[model samples]
Target: EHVAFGSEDIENTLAKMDDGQLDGLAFGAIQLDGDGNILQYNAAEGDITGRDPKQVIGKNFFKDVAPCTDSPEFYGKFKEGVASGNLNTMFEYTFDYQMTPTKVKVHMKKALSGDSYWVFVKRV
Candidate 1:
C-alpha cells in the first residue's frame, strides 16, 4: 500500500500496514509505546535519522534513540497524548542532537488497533 504523509485517517492506515508495506513508504514511520519505547522503526526512518531499526527497537525513543525530541515541544506533547489516549497532532520540528540539524514535519497519532502511537516524518 502507498500511503501519503498527510493522508487523512493516517493512524488507521498505519495500524494496518505490514512490515514490508510500512518500510516501503517514502517518508519516515515510527511506532512507539506510551512510555516512549520504540516498537517499530521503519526503513525510511532509519535513513532519515541514520539509526538502524536493529539498534533502536526496544529502546526509549525520547531518551535513547532521539534525545533531541525529549524537550517540551515534542516529548511533552507525546506524554500528554498518552495520558489522554487521543493523539493527533502535527508540527514542524528539528532533530539536532548527535547529527546535523535536520528539519522535518512530524505527524503524531494514536493507533487505531492498539495502545501504541504513530509518528510520521517528512523532511522539510
Candidate 2:
C-alpha cells in the first residue's frame, strides 16, 4: 500500500522522506534543482515514463528528459517560482514524448528542508 497520490500535506511528507521512502510512493516523485536538473527520480516515475532513473538522473528535465514541458505553462511556471524562491503550484498537464500522451496532475514546490525543488505527478 502507498499514500494517497493527492494527499494535501505531500510537500511536508516529501521533505521528511528518504530516497527509499520516496520510491515507495504510489505517484511519481521527481526532485529537481533550481536549474531543472534531475536530482531524484523515483521508481514510480520510472514506471510511469518507462525511463530508467539511472539514465535520467543529473539530466535537465525540461530540456532533455521532457522537452515537451519547455513551454509557458510548465517550464515558465517553474522558472518563475525558482526566481522568486517560492515554488508551490499545481496544474494539469499532458506528457507527450517518446510514449503515448499521458495526462497527469502536477504539483511543484520548494522542499521545506532543503534547496531542492519537487515535482510530484499523479496520472489522472
Candidate 3:
C-alpha cells in the first residue's frame, strides 16, 4: 500500500493507464469524470480505503461519498482543474475520508488525452 513520494514508478503506472492498460499495476487509481462521479475504481484503491468498488463506482465522489475531501484543498483543486482543463497535477495530502487519517500523495491526471480525469492515491 505504501508508495515513494514523487516516484517514477507511479508515473509509469499512469502512463500505462494512459495507453489503455488497466492491469492493476497502480495503487488507488480512481477514474472520475468532470461531474466528479466515479467511473472506475481499481482494486488497490478499494483495498486501501476499505471500500468496495461497488460502493464507490457510479457515485459522486467528493460530494456524496468522500465528503471529508470536499474541502477547498482537495475537491477544490479538482473543480479548478476541471474548469481550467488542467488536471495533470500532483500533491501530498491526507485522506480522512474514513474515521482514521492517512497521509497520501495524490495525482489528479488527465485521461483519454484530456477528456477525462483520474485520482491516483498512494499511501505515504
Candidate 4:
C-alpha cells in the first residue's frame, strides 16, 4: 500500500520535471509581504488551500491561512531560518486527508518588505 517513498519518489519526479513529462497537479506560487501578509497568490494555490486569494491578500499567513503549521512545521522552520541566518530552504511535505496524498516539494524563499521577512511556497 505504500505508493510513495521519500527520495525515490523525489528523484523520479525530478527526472520527470527535467524531461518535461510531469503531468501531475501543480499550484502556482503565492507572494507575501515580509510580515506574512498575502500579496499576490495564484488561483491554483487558492483552490488547493481552500482559501480565497482576494479575502486573504494583505492578511497574515501564520495567523489566518494555515494555523495548523504553528504547532511545528511552519513555526519551526521560521525559527530555524532566523537563528541560522539561512534565507531559503527546500522541504518535501505531504498534505493530509487528500485523495492522492498530495506531496509537495516546497522551496521557501525569504522576502524583504518594509521591515519583516516572509516565506513563500511554490509546488516545486
Candidate-wise lDDT, in order: 0.89, 0.87, 0.73, 0.49
Candidate 4 wrong stretches, greater than 4 Å:
1-26, 79-86, 95-102, 112-124
Clash-forming residue pairs, model 4: none
lDDT of 3 by residue, 1-124 (tens): 3444345455444543532244244567787889899977877777767788767778999888788789888899998988888666788887776558888888887664545687888887
lDDT string for model 1 (32-81, tens) is: 99999988888999888899886888999998878889988999999999
Off by over 4 Å in 3: 1-23
Residue 114, model 2, lDDT: 62
Runs of candidate 2 exceeding 4 Å displacement: none
Clashing pairs in 2: none
Model 3, total clashes: 0
TM-score of each: 0.95, 0.91, 0.78, 0.55
Task: State each candidate's clash count.
Answer: 0, 0, 0, 0
Q: How accurate is candidate 1 locally (lDDT)?
A: 0.89
The total number of steric clashes, by the backbone 3 Å criterion, in model 4 comes to: 0
lDDT of 2 by residue, 7-54 (tens): 776677777677788888888999999999998999999988888987
